Scaffold this active site. Structure first.
Site, PDB file in Angstrom:
ATOM      1  N   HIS B  41       0.855  -1.220   0.000  1.00  0.00           N
ATOM      2  CA  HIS B  41       0.000   0.000   0.000  1.00  0.00           C
ATOM      3  C   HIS B  41       0.880   1.256   0.000  1.00  0.00           C
ATOM      4  CE1 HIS B  41      -0.256  -0.112   4.616  1.00  0.00           C
ATOM      5  NE2 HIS B  41       0.164   1.115   4.336  1.00  0.00           N
ATOM      6  N   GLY B 143       2.564   6.398   9.404  1.00  0.00           N
ATOM      7  CA  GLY B 143       3.999   6.289   9.096  1.00  0.00           C
ATOM      8  C   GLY B 143       4.641   5.046   9.711  1.00  0.00           C
ATOM      9  N   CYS B 145       3.533   1.894   9.360  1.00  0.00           N
ATOM     10  CA  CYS B 145       3.389   0.736   8.460  1.00  0.00           C
ATOM     11  C   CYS B 145       4.786   0.268   8.036  1.00  0.00           C
ATOM     12  CB  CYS B 145       2.454   1.062   7.299  1.00  0.00           C
ATOM     13  SG  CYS B 145       0.751   1.367   7.843  1.00  0.00           S
TER      14      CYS B 145
END
Ligand SMILES: O=C(c1ccc2c(c1)OCO2)N1CCCCCC1
Ligand SMILES: O=C(c1ccc2c(c1)OCO2)N1CCCCCC1
Lengths: 304, 304
Positions: B41, B143, B145
C-alpha cells in the site's frame, strides 16, 4: 492508535554490555569509551555480602583480577577505581560502539528502559519507573546485576540506573552511573525494607489523557476539583501529592484533549472512590502510573 | 525475581529498518540481504486505499519510483516485485547488518516484539500477542506501516509480522513476511470488523505459574478440574478452549512449581467465577494472556 508500555530501542545499549568476572562472581558491565562500569559487589562472595568492607576487599584485587569479556574477546584492564557503589575498570580499548551518552540521576516517577542482561548478553528490554520509595519493580535473576536503565533523546543515551540488588520483598534497588544508590539502600545483604509504594499521580493523569486520545473515555465525569481537594483524596489512596509543577507538565495533553487538568483530577478522584466496576482503561483494570507526561506525548506523536 | 512484559532486545532489527517512499507515501521497510520488504500500500494515495487494484497501480511504478533510504544514504533499487501484500525491492547493496533470520507465520496466542518505526527510524519496542481473532493490539501512528514483529532464538531473528493497517476499532492487522495477512483482513479501507477477542487460556495459565514462581500465590485454591469441565467455564468467559497440547506445553512449569496443570485450571476457573475482588497478580488486576509458556520459562530461567 493504541497505547503500549513501550521501551526505547535497545541497540545502542546492547553495544555497551560486557561480562565482568572477579574470582567466582560473574555479572554485567557497561563499556563506554575505555571505562567499564559495574557494581562493586562483583568483588564479593555470597559470604562477603553479609557485611562487606569494600575498601578492604578491593586491596586484595589487582587490574588482572577483573576479567572483562565483550562477546568472545577479552579486554585488558589497565586501571580500576571504586566510585561510591560502582567499579570503573579502565580498559586499553575504547568501545567502538560507544553511543553519545550522559549519566543522569532521575527523580521518583521518572520512567526508563532496562536492558536485562546475563553474562554480558542481553535477554530482554522492559519499561519501568523509579518508584516514590526509590525501588523499581524489575525482572532480575542472579547474574543480572550491572544491567542498566536508560532513556534516549534522539541519538544520546541517558544512563540513569544500574541494577545492584533485590530486597527480601523481591523489589529492586540500584544506583545511578556515579554509583549512588537510589533511596536509602546499600549493597549489603541486610534487613532493608522499602517504604510505602505510592502511586505516581502525575503519571496516572498522563495515562488517562493517553486513554482519551486513544478513544477510551467512559471514565470522563461531569466534575472538576482543586489541587487541595484532590490531594486529600490522593493522600487517602496512597497517591503522591499533585503539585502545580505536575499540572504545568500536563498542559500539552490538557490542550490536545481540551480536558482541563483539574477536570481529569476529578475523574481520577471518582475512579479512586468508585473503583473501575470491572471496566478497563487501555486494557488495564488498574490505574497505570509508569507513563510520564513526556512518554504519553512521545508515543502519541511518534518521536524517533 | 519479578516478572515484566519483556520484549526481545531490538538492536538486530534496528539494523534492518529503512524508509520507503513511493510518490507522497512514506513508511518503513525491512532490509535483509539485498531485498527491502514493505507493505504494497506504499504505492497507494489515501484515495487509492478505498478500492485499490494493486496490480494496476504497480504498472505505473518503476524501480526508480521507490525511494529507499537507510540512515541518510539512498539505496539503488534494481528490481521490485509484489508477493501477496508486500513489495520486495531488490537493492544493489546487501544490508551489512543483516542478522541470521527466518520468516515464520505464527499461530494465534504466540507473542512477539514489535519495533515501532517512523520514517525508517525506531521509536520504541513492545511485546504483544497474535490475538485469537488475528488482530494485534499495537501502538501504531501514521507512518508506522512496515514496522515488524519478531522473536529471537539466540542470534537468529524470526520475523513473524509486518504492520499494514488499523481497523476502524483501533486494533491492528498485518502480514507475515511473505505478505499473507493474519486472519481475513485486506489492505483496503473498507468495513473490516474483528471477531471475538477471546483470552489466550494457555498464556493465562503460564502467567499464573510465573506468579507462583515470583511469590504471588493468594489465588491458589483447594480444587482441581478436568479439561472438559474447565472448557465449559472457558467458553462462558470467552477464553480459548484448552487442549491436551496446551497441558503438555505447561508441563515444565507444572514440574518446577509442583502444581498440576488441571489444579491451576481450577484456580483460574475460581478467578473467572469469583473475580479478583480488588486483588492483583504480578501487579495486574486482570488475567494477563500475552506471555506464552515459552516466554515464562525464558524469563524465569534468564535465556540470552
Ligand atoms: O459500573 C459498572 C459498569 C458498567 C458498564 C461496564 C462495566 C461496569 O464494565 C464493562 O462495561 N457496574 C456494573 C453494573 C452495575 C452498575 C454499577 C457497576
Ligand atoms: O476477596 C477479597 C479480598 C481479600 C484480601 C485482599 C483483597 C481482596 O485485595 C487485597 O487483599 N474481598 C475483599 C473483602 C471482602 C471479602 C470478599 C472479597
Amino acid at each position: 492508535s493504541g497505547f503500549r508500555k513501550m521501551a526505547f530501542p535497545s541497540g545502542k545499549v546492547e553495544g555497551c554490555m560486557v561480562q565482568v568476572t572477579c574470582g567466582t562472581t560473574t555479572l554485567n558491565g557497561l563499556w563506554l569509551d575505555d571505562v567499564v562500569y559495574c557494581p562493586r559487589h562483583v568483588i564479593c562472595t555470597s559470604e562477603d555480602m553479609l557485611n562487606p568492607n569494600y575498601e578492604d576487599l578491593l586491596i586484595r584485587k589487582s587490574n588482572h583480577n577483573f576479567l572483562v569479556q565483550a562477546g568472545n574477546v577479552q579486554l585488558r584492564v589497565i586501571g580500576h577505581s571504586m566510585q561510591n557503589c560502582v567499579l570503573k575498570l579502565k580498559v586499553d580499548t575504547a568501545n567502538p560502539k560507544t553511543p553519545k551518552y550522559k549519566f543522569v540521576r532521575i527523580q521518583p516517577g521518572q520512567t526508563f528502559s532496562v536492558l536485562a542482561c546475563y553474562n554480558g548478553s542481553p535477554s530482554g528490554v522492559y519499561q519501568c519507573a523509579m518508584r516514590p520509595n526509590f525501588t523499581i519493580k524489575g525482572s532480575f535473576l542472579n547474574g543480572s546485576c550491572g544491567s542498566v536503565g536508560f532513556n534516549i533523546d534522539y541519538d544520546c543515551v541517558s544512563f540513569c540506573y544500574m541494577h545492584h540488588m533485590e530486597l527480601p520483598t523481591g523489589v529492586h534497588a540500584g544506583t545511578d552511573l556515579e554509583g549512588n544508590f537510589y533511596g536509602p539502600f546499600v549493597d549489603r545483604q541486610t534487613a532493608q525494607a522499602a517504604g510505602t509504594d505510592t502511586t505516581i499521580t502525575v503519571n496516572v493523569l498522563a495515562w488517562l489523557y493517553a486513554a482519551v486520545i486513544n478513544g477510551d473515555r467512559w471514565f470522563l465525569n461531569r466534575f472538576t476539583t482543586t489541587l487541595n481537594d484532590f490531594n486529600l483524596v490522593a493522600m487517602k489512596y496512597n497517591y503522591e501529592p499533585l503539585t502545580q509543577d505536575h499540572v504545568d507538565i500536563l498542559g500539552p495533553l490538557s490542550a490536545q484533549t481540551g480536558i482541563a487538568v483539574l477536570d481529569m483530577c476529578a475523574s481520577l478522584k471518582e475512579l479512586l472512590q468508585n473503583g473501575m466496576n470491572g471496566r478497563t482503561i487501555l486494557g488495564s483494570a488498574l490505574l497505570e502510573d509508569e507513563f510520564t507526561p513526556f512518554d504519553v506525548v512521545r508515543q502519541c506523536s511518534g518521536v524517533t
